[PDB]
Amino acid sequence: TLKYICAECSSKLSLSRTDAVRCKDCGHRILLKARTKRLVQFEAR
Amino acid sequence: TFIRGPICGTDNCPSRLWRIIDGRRTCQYGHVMEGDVEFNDDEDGAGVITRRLNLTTNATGSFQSSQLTNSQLLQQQQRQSHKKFKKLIGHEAKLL
Amino acid sequence: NENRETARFIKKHKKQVTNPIDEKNGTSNCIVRVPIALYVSLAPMYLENPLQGVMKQHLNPLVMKYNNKVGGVVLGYEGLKILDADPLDTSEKLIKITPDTPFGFTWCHVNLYVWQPQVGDVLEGYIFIQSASHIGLLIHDAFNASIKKNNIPVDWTFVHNLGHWVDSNGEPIDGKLRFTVRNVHTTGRVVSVDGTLIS
Amino acid sequence: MYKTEKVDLALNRNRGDPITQHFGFGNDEWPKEWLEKLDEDGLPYIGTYVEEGDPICAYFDDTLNKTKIKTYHSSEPAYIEEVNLIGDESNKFQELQTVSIKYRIRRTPQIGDKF
Amino acid sequence: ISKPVGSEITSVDFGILTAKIRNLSAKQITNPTVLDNLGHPVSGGLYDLALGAFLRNLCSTCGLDEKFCPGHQGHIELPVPCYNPLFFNQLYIYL
Amino acid sequence: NLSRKLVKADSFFMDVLVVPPTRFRLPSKLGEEVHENSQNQLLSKVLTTSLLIRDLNDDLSKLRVIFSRLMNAFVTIQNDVNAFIDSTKAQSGKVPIPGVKQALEKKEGLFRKHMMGKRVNYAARSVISPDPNIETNEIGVPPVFAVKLTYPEPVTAYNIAELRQAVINGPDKWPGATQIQNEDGSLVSLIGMSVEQRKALANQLLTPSSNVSTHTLNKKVYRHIKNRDVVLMNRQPTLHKASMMGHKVRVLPNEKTLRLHYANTGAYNADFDGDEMNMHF
Amino acid sequence: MMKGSRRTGNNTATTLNTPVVIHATQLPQHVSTDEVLQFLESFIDEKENTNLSSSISQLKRIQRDFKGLP
Amino acid sequence: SAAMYSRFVKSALDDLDKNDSTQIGIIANQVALPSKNPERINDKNLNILLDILSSNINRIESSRGTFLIQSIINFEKWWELPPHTLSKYIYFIKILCSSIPKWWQDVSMILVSCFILPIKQTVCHHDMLKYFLRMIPSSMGFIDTYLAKFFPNKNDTRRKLVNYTSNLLKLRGYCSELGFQIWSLLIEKIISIDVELQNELDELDDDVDDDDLEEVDLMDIIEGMDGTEEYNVELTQGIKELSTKLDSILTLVSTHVEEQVTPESLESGEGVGVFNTLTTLFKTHVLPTYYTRSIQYIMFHVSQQQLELMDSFLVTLIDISFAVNEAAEKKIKSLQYLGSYIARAKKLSRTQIIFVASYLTSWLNRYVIEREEEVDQRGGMERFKHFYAAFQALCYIFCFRHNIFRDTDGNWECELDKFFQRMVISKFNPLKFCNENVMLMFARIAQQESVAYCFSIIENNNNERTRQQFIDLQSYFPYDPLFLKNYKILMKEYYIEWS
Amino acid sequence: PEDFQQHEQIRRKTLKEKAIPKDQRATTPYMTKYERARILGTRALQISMNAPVFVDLEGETDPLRIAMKELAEKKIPLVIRRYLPDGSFEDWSVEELIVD
Amino acid sequence: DRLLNSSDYTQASVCRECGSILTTQQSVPRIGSISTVCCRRCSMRFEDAKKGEKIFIDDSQIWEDGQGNKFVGGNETTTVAIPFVLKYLDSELSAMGIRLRYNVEPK
Amino acid sequence: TTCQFLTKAVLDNEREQLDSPSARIVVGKLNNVGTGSFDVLAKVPNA
């Protein structure tokens, strides 16, 4: 289950098609994408 | 990487094409055809010339892209087709 | 005021030497020696034997082909002579290297034996095959002729079984045939000779 | 070194023009191997390593029946730091058309840097 | 360097094109339309296909394609002789 | 005068224009937005007016106002070919359409930008760096530059041992090659290949092709820039001829900058704090 | 393109192949039949003492034509 | 029907004089339909269209008469017609190109492009082709451009590749005036597949029995598809194809050249011309090919049939290897080729073996005064690389052919048991500077023949021990054993095993 | 026809009134720094196109370094044509010039 | 090298009679021939066949283009090595009514 | 003042001799200041 985060009230929030791009608890518009469990790799340098 | 174009010369490679380091297109078997020079412009207002645009010069070369209404034939009729629930249900409604 | 321009075109296409009908054979003459001047390129690999280099690069591609400037079929050549760029003769000539490339360009004289027939000529070639559309001939065992059906007299028929051609006097015609030369063609790399038997 | 990039799909329209191009993928076709950099909403996973040429978001326009991507074109490789989703202001029903991605370019002291 | 050039340009004459341009290019251009709807080069327009190949069509003059054709010129028949703004200051002396 | 042609008056008058070929009048473009050309914009205005002054000549052909638009049409058929050649010698919104004369006269234009000042292939530029461990007549080439710049070396009997090894190494390993030219003029790129095809193609270099048109020519391996080539090296304000000198090439591993001796810093007038120098090969 | 390169590979008449200019420097002067066979016997003997093989065998047909019979 | 369509085609033929050309675009279109579209003309009406057009020729000589002769040319599968239409189709072209000698530009575009198909598929193709060689003499030139252009792709199946060279070795015996343009087109286009094989040579080919697979086996797709069709790479090149392509092609080269050499054609025919057109093609093509096996067997297969064909090549091979007017790395490679051709050839004369070695030891004994105090001067040992290469070829003979030089008594011919006694202790030390392995086995054999005792001097290199392209030519033995599974069966009589 | 021969005769006679003879040339007997760069340029550009080399090249693969060895032993078969500014010229061979 | 042999360097065709670059053309060959390069303002259309008792054309002087015509003459072209901007410069001066005649001395 | 001199060169009907170095670079001819100031000629042995 992919989700997002409201930038204002910090509530985790998934979003579907035919939805207003808003938070659903506060009415905030700016709504940043959370990070999920996914493999990236690095040299330890 | 590969961009499918015409068949190739040399009586060897019948295949698609592929651009090479910055300037020319080859087949994937090594052979390269002539005149392939990619014709990219510079960038310098620049004259009061901002109108009459029809093309989009796709496919890594000169021109001929974005033909006018080559996919619009189903586009003005897919606003009235994609969405459901149009309240045109007359006799099926008595069944509904 | 309409003569100083039209004269510049007639002498461009008027052929220099016409073919004469010679030794009262009926057969005209078409083998002719002509001296020419070339402007060729000697290459670095032939820089030790320059005559062999011009002969193998420019002279051998030219033989047995029709050439535009001499108006005929270049049979052979004789007497190649490289012009020296040092007007001092000698063996150790010297030619000029181009600035960009290692190639050297020079002038050369040579005599071309060319085969130049024109219209109004008479040739005797052997008939290769014959049909009810044409008569095909090997002019001097190397060239090709084609006497088409409108260019044959009407009183000459063709008996069929393929078959021999029939003349007016009932003679099945033999190979060694006299024929009058019509418009000589250029079109294919095969260079043909149109003809007439009418007059 | 941080760096943002506003990805806008409403540059090409007027206010009286309906929607044409939509974030997310298309179906009835196979956009190959773009799902390693991108998520199923057409936005990149954050933390992802992108080079020049790599896709940076997927969109589906209805005027081509075709899924095109936008491309991170820069000489320096980066990591997706942030992806923000800008909502509308005028009406309460249209799809999201403005996304501002933030990239992170690491800069070790290479030979030629001035101290 | 393996393609040598023989003949080469040694001097350059200046001059004026006489109105016998009709010899080298009678592919003259009368329609002020550049492209029609559905993107074709119109005949007798400023993008005619006898002026060289364009939009992956062949040249009507070369027979060659988009790249290999050198391009070709075309004239616009003015019905009246209006003078040249380059040589105008030096005929106004002579008038 | 050796042709003794007559000085005529229709040298001053233009009965026809000529139109440049379509290659010289391709559409302008910004991004996806492919606009219409400057040259077609002026040249259509003449062609509408020519049809008008032809169509209106049919209107006056059946006999006032029609004589006052014909004479005004001669003002503007002259004014639109004056616009086709000049820009200031026509009328213009703020900055009018460039004519063919005004595409020629400044530092930019044509005659100084593209005839004295052309841009070149086989060149590179980079920040320079100090080095006392190279010779004074040398430049230290990075391996980034070294595997791009190629020199056509014709394969002969004395260099097939060093040009077989160039085709085998390929365009990744440094003393190698990128493409070979056949005797007919076509090239063969070695980029996507593996060591199977490259070793089987290095062994065919001295093989003659069966043709007789090209029995003189040999193949050309485009080897990389080795340690025995030279280079024009160019500090950018070239105020004198010692600002463009010819260095020898020494390919240094593990570097990202051109790398120059201290003895050359007075000649180019360089201070080692971010100067770029052009490397012409 | 391919068949654009076939027509470059059709002719292939360059400055190693063909001369730059050729001019006929005098009037063409005919020879007798007696000097053609005088020429074709020495020219064939010179070129047969590679290519030119498709050319000399046509001359030998021409050489045989002035004295023999197919 | 037969009387109905006979005047159907004359009405269209009379449209030249009516000047509209009505059914020329229809009647000749009908004969231009493919075989897979059965709406085409039948053969009965094809006899109708042919004999009208064979018997009247005046009314086609125009640009409106172009398209119908195009259709007779583009008639696909003309060689699979019944003989009352086939033998009438053949007679058309023999008088089409006779009447207009322009179309032969385009007829052998079709005739040479059908040489892909097998021999008995195309026996009528050479009947018309040889006809126009004795008919049109000025067509030998541009035919050669049609053979090189319609030579098949390198990565085709062998069906296009063993039947093209079979139809092109067919073309040689009918016209030896062509001759040299056949083999130059073969030999250079064998190296294309040949040298893609030895650089693989790591593990063996499994003898899978499915070699000869099948007998005779016997849609527009023209759209606007020039966009991106990305990432469909599947980069794989086969290997066991390439050993069987050289099994297929180069056996048929050596089976047909086995026909071309026999003393009925070497003494009164053109068999010596075969032998000269390959030796002059040997020293130009195959000798500057680096690291190439399996193609110098063709000159090996031919120069062993007679005593003359051997001896008319040994003097040729040596003149490459000892004239000053050549390149040195050609001279070393021919010495490299000479010792391996003598010692790895079965059917030779024993007096041929000695005269190579007698001349070779003469060259070392003509070396015996001039260049044997140059060593102590300021230079290197690389000044003598021609001398070491010749002595190395001498060692490679004696490691194989040693019992020949034993005479009836038990002594050695031409002081070979005294010659190496001088060469080893000379001031060149040819034990070190030649190849290691040919000198390692020469030391063992000199003990088992009692000729030299050069163990202790090869031992005398402990602290005692440009060059890389000279070490590597010592490692290229030309007559290494063949990898080809099916060509060695012919070579087993000719080529000697290890023991 | 003969109109070519009327022009070739003029072209070579004009090229005879520019050739200064070998006894009367009055330029320097030195190889003047630009011949040497162009002789070694052009000769190396020939050796790379399979010209006959008249020096024992000893493992030298560089075509320019070969020409520098053909120059030191006077084995280069070239001729310099020194143009005087009216058009007339002096043909100096490479063997008789003195290299720096 | 740094202003011709690396920047543009075309081998163009030039008529040796009118001395012009942009009046040249490779002909559309009739189906047997090989295409050749032939000038345009030195050419004369085949309709001009106006009046050796007859002045018939040798048929090697006759070339075609794809728009249909037959021209007579237009030969004597060569191949010179110029920059490409000279081809573009000579197409801008033609718009000004100015021609550049190039003298090509090997004739 | 490019087309100032251009009209002057046409009304003069001038032949450009192509010997200034700014005129040789335009037409692509080799400059003749330095190594272009002479011609190299190769000596061939056979007549």
To the nearest whole angstrom, how far is the Cα of C87 from the nearest Cα of chain F? 29
Rounded Cα–Cα distance for residues C37 and G20 (Å): 11
Cross-chain Cβ contact A35/D45 below 8 Å: yes
SS (H, E, C) chain D: CEEEEEEECCCCCCCCCCCCEEECCCCCCCCCCCCCCECCCCCECCCCEECCCCEEEEEEECCCCEEEEEECCCCCCEEEEEEEEECCCCCCCCCCCEEEEEEECCCCCCCCCCC
Count of residues making up chain I: 100
> Minimal Cα–Cα distance from J87 to chain C, Å?
21
C-alpha to C-alpha distances, E38 to B55, B69, E30, nearest whole angstrom: 11, 8, 21
Phi-psi region of B52 (alpha: psi -120 to 50; beta: other; left: phi over 0): left
Q: Which of residues 66-85 of E touch G (CB under 8 A)?
A: 67-68
**Does the beta carbon of I50 lie under 8 angstroms from any beta carbon of chain C?**
yes
Report the C-alpha gap between C5 and C28 in whole angstroms: 34
Q: CB count, 10 Å around CB of H492? A: 11
Q: Tokens for E11?
A: 């001097």
Q: Which of F234, F220, F267 is nearest to F123 (CA)?
A: F234
Query: Distance between CA atoms of C106 and C39, rounded to whole angstroms?
Result: 6
- The distance between the two most distant Cα atoms of chain K, rounded to a whole number of Å, is 55
User: Considering only CA atoms, which of H352, H425, H356 is closest in space to residue H390?
Assistant: H356
Q: Return all residues near G35 (Cβ < 8 A) that are at least 6 apart.
A: none
Instruction: For the beta carbon of residue H185, count every other beta carbon within 10 angstroms.
Output: 17
* Relative orientation angle of helices H436-449 and H385-398, to the nearest 10 degrees: 50
Residues making up the annotated binding site of A for Zn(2+) are: 6, 9, 23, 26
Burial C110-124 (b: 16+ CB within 10 A, else e): bbbbbbbbbbebbbe
Strands I78-83 and F177-181: unpaired
- How many Cβ atoms from other residues are within 10 Å of residue B63's Cβ? 18
Does the structural domain D1-108 have CATH classification 2.40.50.150?
Answer: yes
Q: Over the Cα atoms of chain B, what is R_g? A: 24
Give CA–CA dist H8/E34, Å, rounded.
47
The torsion angles phi and psi of F130, rounded to 5 degrees, stand at -75, 150
Pairing label, strands I98-99, K15-16: unpaired
For chain G, how many structural domains are there in total? Answer: 1
* Residue range of the domain that includes C35: 31-115
What is the radius of gyration, based on Cα positions, of chain I?
A: 17
Chain G partners within 8 Å of B33 (Cβ): 1-2, 5
Contacts of H105 in chain J (CB under 8 A): 31-32
What span, in angstroms and rounded, lies between the C-alpha atoms of F75 and F69?
10
Residues in chain D: 115
Among H279, H312, H323, H39, smallest CA distance to H180 is for H279
Residue F140 β-bridge partners: F250, F259
- Distance between CA atoms of D29 and F105, rounded to whole angstroms? 54
At C193, which helix (H) or strand (E)?
strand C192-196
Q: Quote the tokens at residue H141.
A: 């030139």
Q: How far is G18 from chain B (nearest CA, A)?
A: 23
Q: Name the burial class of residue H137, with classes exposed (0-12), middle (13-18) and buried (19+) by CB atoms within 10 angstroms of its CB.
A: buried
- Spatial contact of E15 and K13, defined as CB atoms under 8 Å apart: yes
| Cβ partners under 8 Å of residue H68, min gap 6 | H24, H27, H28, H53, H60
Residue numbers in F near H192 (CB within 8 A): 204
Q: Check CB contact of K39 with chain E, cutoff 8 Å.
A: no
* Adjacency order of strands within the sheet including A4-6: A12-13, A4-6, A31-32
CB C115 within 8 A of CB C75: yes
Tokens of C98: 């181009």
Could you give the count of Cα atoms lying within 13 Å of C8 in the half-sphere of its Cβ?
8
Q: Which of residues 213-252 of H touch B (CB under 8 A)?
A: 225-233, 235
* Residue C56, min C-alpha distance to chain F (Å): 9
**Do H445 and H454 contact (CB within 8 A), yes or no?**
no
Residue type, H22: T
Pair K41, I78: CB distance under 8 Å: yes
Residue I45's domain is classified under what CATH number?
3.90.940.10
Q: Do K42 and I38 touch (CB under 8 A)?
A: no
**Residue B87 labelled as part of a binding site:** no
The experimental resolution of this structure, in angstroms, equals 2.9
* Residue J31 sits at the chain H interface (C-beta within 8 Å): yes
Token pair of F170, please? 């390929």
Chain F residue numbers with beta carbons less than 8 Å from the beta carbon of K22 are 116
E66 beta partners: none
Residue that has been written with the tokens 């105008």 in this structure: E88
Show Cβ contacts of residue F204 under 8 Å, excluding neighbours closer than 6 positions: H191, H192, H195, H289
Contact H430, H396 (CB under 8 A): no
* Beta bridge pairs of residue F150: F224
Say how far apart CA C55 and CA C52 lie, in whole Å: 5
**Longest CA span, chain D:** 55
Q: What are phi and psi of F123, to 5 degrees?
A: -140, 160
Q: Please, which chains are in contact with B (at least 3 CB pairs closer than 8 A)?
A: D, E, F, G, H
Chain G nearest C-alpha distance from H178 (Å): 6
H139: closest chain C residue by CA: C190
Token pair for residue J102? 């190039």
H183 vs H16: CA distance, rounded Å: 49
Q: Phi/psi of residue F171, each to 5°?
A: -85, 40
| First and final C-alpha spacing in chain K | 55
What are chain F's partners, defined as 3 or more CB pairs within 8 angstroms? B, C, D, E, G, H, I, J, K
Give the DSSP letter of residue C82. E
Q: SS3 of C67, please? A: strand
| Span between the terminal Cα atoms of chain A, in Å | 34
What residue has token string 């896709």?
Answer: D55
Residues followed by a break in chain H, C–N over 2.5 Å?
A: 218, 465
CA distances from J57 to F149, F267, H472, J26, J50 (A): 54, 68, 66, 20, 11
H481 DSSP 8-state letter: P
Residues near B8 by Cβ (< 8 Å), separated by ≥ 6? B14, B15, B17, B27, B29, B31, B33, G2
Domain limits of chain D? 1-108
Quick one: DSSP state of residue H406? B
CA distance F191 to J79: 34
Q: Residue C71: CB partners within 8 Å, gap ≥ 6? A: C15, C114, C116, J58
Domain span holding position H70: 1-499
Domains, chain A, ordered by start: 1-45 (2.20.28.30)
Pairing of strands F230-235, F276-280: antiparallel
Q: Do you know the residue count of chain C?
A: 199
Surface of H (207-246) touching F: CB under 8 A: 235, 237
How close does chain H come to G56, measured CA to CA in Å? 9
C139 neighbors C167 (Cβ within 8 angstroms): no
> Any binding-site annotation on E72?
yes
CATH number at residue C49: 3.30.1490.120
- Greatest alpha-carbon span in chain H: 103
* Nearest partner of K45 among I45, C95, G49, judged by Cα: C95
Nearest to J106 by CA among J76, J84, J86: J76
CA distance E19 to F11: 9
Residue G53's closest CA among H143, F227, D27, F53? H143
Distance CA(C155)–CA(C167), nearest Å, equals: 7
Q: State how far the alpha carbon of H406 is from the alpha carbons of H362, H412, H413, H421, in Å.
A: 19, 5, 7, 17
C141 and chain G in contact, CB less than 8 A: yes
Q: Give CA–CA dist C136/C144, Å, rounded.
A: 7
Structural domain for I93, as ranges: 1-100
Method by which this entry was solved: cryo-EM
| CA B46, B51, B56, B61 torsion-angle sign | negative
* Residue of chain F minimizing CA distance to K21: F116
Query: Which residue, D25, D29, D82, is CA-closest to D59?
Result: D25
Mutate to test the interface with G, among J26, J34, J76 (most CBs of G within 10 A): J34
Contacts of K36 in chain C (CB under 8 A): 99
Instruction: Report the candidate in B58, D74, B69, D28 with the shortest Cα–Cα distance to residue H228.
Output: B58
Inter-chain residue contact J32 with H66, CB threshold 8 Å: no
- Which of E17, E48, E73, E87 has the highest number of chain J CBs within 10 A, making it the mutation to test binding with J? E17
The sign of the torsion formed by the CA atoms of D43, D45, D47, D50 equals negative
Q: For residue C117, give both structure tokens.
A: 């027939």
Q: Which residue in the set B20, B41, B53 is minimally distant from F33, CB to CB?
A: B53
Pair H176, H215: CB distance under 8 Å: no
**Interface residues from chain F to H (CB-CB < 8 Å):** 157, 160-161, 164, 192, 195-197, 199-200, 202-204, 206-211
Nearest chain J residue to C185 by CA: give it. J59
CATH dotted code for J1-104: 3.90.1800.10
- The tokens for G36 are 């053609």
C84-89: long-range contacts (C-beta < 8 A, 24 or more apart)?
C85/K41, C86/I19, C86/I79, C86/I91, C86/K41, C87/I12, C87/I15, C87/I16, C87/I19
Distances in whole angstroms, Cα of residue B29 to Cα of each of B9, H34, H311 = 11, 32, 44
Amino acid type, D25: F
H191: which chain F residues are within 8 Å (Cβ-Cβ)?
204, 207
The answer to whether F125 faces chain D, any CB pair under 8 Å, is no
- Residues whose CB is less than 8 angstroms from the CB of residue G48 and which lie 6 or more positions away in sequence, other chains included: G56
**G27 Cβ contact list (under 8 Å, min separation 6):** C16, C17, C34, I1, I2
Integer Cα distance of F6 and C180 in angstroms: 49
Q: Which of residues 57-96 of I touch E (CB under 8 A)?
A: none
Taking CB atoms and an 8 Å cutoff, what residues of chain G touch I2? 25-27
Q: Supply D90's token pair.
A: 């005028």
Residue F132, judged by CB atoms within 10 A of its CB (0-12, 13-18, 19+), counts as exposed
Element (H, E) at F181: strand F177-181
Nearest-Cα distance to chain K for F11, in Å, is 10
Question: Pick from I8, I50, I91: which is nearest to C45 by CB?
Answer: I50
Whole-angstrom CA distances from C69 to C29, C34, C113, C190, G26 are 19, 11, 13, 18, 12
Closest CA to J87 of J104, J102, J107, J105: J102
E82 is in an annotated binding site: no
Chain F nearest-CA residue for I46: F154
Burial level of G47, CB count in 10 A (0-12/13-18/19+)?
Answer: middle
* Cross-chain CB nearest to F206 (options H199, H237, H288): H288
> At which residue do the structure tokens 């980079």 appear?
F126
Please give the full DSSP string across J84-105, using - where no structure is assigned.
HHHHHHHHHTTTTTEEEEEEE-
Whether residue D85 and residue A38 make contact (CB cut-off 8 A), yes or no, is no
Chains contacting chain J through 3 or more C-beta pairs under 8 A: C, E, F, G, H, K
Residue I21 to residues I24, I25, I26, I90, I92: CA-CA distances in angstroms?
6, 6, 10, 7, 10
* CB-CB contact of F105 with K3 (8 Å): yes
Do residue F22 and residue E47 have CB atoms under 8 angstroms apart? Answer: yes
In sequence order, what are the beta bridge partners of I90? I82
Cβ(D80)–Cβ(D47) under 8 Å? yes
> Cα(J66)–Cα(J50) distance, rounded to whole angstroms?
25
Longest distance between any two alpha carbons in chain B, whole Å: 72
Which helix H or strand E contains H448, and what residues bound it? helix H436-449
User: Distance from A15 to chain D by nearest Cα, in Å?
Assistant: 10
Residue with tokens 């690069």: C57
| Residues recorded for chain K | 47
Burial label, F9 (beta-carbon count in 10 A; 0-12, 13-18, 19+) = exposed
Question: What Å distances lie between residue H319 and F156, H150, H345, H359, CA to CA?
Answer: 22, 37, 20, 12
**Spatial distance between the Cα atoms of F23 and E53, rounded to a whole number of angstroms:** 8
Give the largest Cα separation in chain A, rounded: 45
DSSP-based helix, strand, coil % in chain J, nearest 5: 10, 30, 60
> Which one, of K31, K14, K13, lies nearest residue K22 by Cα?
K31
Residues sharing a CB contact under 8 Å with residue I15, sequence separation 6 or more, in sequence order = C87
Provide Rg for chain F, Cα atoms: 30
- The answer to whether the beta carbons of residues H265 and H271 sit under 8 Å apart is yes
Under 8 Å between Cβ of E52 and E41: no
Q: Are D103 and D51 in contact (CB under 8 A)?
A: no
Q: Which residues, at least 6 apart from I41, have a Cβ–Cβ distance to it below 8 Å?
A: I64, K35
Nearest CA-CA distance, residue J51 and chain K, Å: 35
